[PDB]
Amino acid sequence: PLSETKCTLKSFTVEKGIYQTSNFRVQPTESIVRNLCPFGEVFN
Amino acid sequence: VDCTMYICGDSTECSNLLLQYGSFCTQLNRALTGIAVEQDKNTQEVFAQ
C-alpha cells in the first residue's frame, strides 16, 4: 500500500503528509439465489 | 467520489472503457480533493487564529 501512492505522485520523493491511494472494496463470498412438476402424478 | 465505482458499478466491462477517457476519472478526485483539502483551511484560519 505504500508503493501504490508513489505511483500517484509519480515521484520517488514523497513529501511529509497524507496521500490518497486507490480505493479498496470488500468482495463477495458467495451468491445467494432465493412449484413442483407432477412427476408423482405422471409416473405414478 | 470514486469515479471508477460511481460510473461503472463494480464491473470491469465498464471499467475498461473508462480507461479510454483518461484523466477524467482521476482529475475529478484531484478537483474534489482540491476542495476538501482547503475546506479545512477555511475552518483553520477562521476559528484558529
Swiss-Prot record, chain B:
Disulfide bonds join C3-C25, C8-C14. The chain holds residues 736 to 784 of 1273 of the full protein. Precursor of the fusion protein processed in the biosynthesis of the S protein and the formation of virus particle. Mediates fusion of the virion and cellular membranes by functioning as a class I viral fusion protein. Contains two viral fusion peptides that are unmasked after cleavage. The S2/S2' cleavage occurs during virus entry at the cell membrane by host TMPRSS2 or during endocytosis by host CSTL. This is Spike protein S2. It comes from the Viruses.
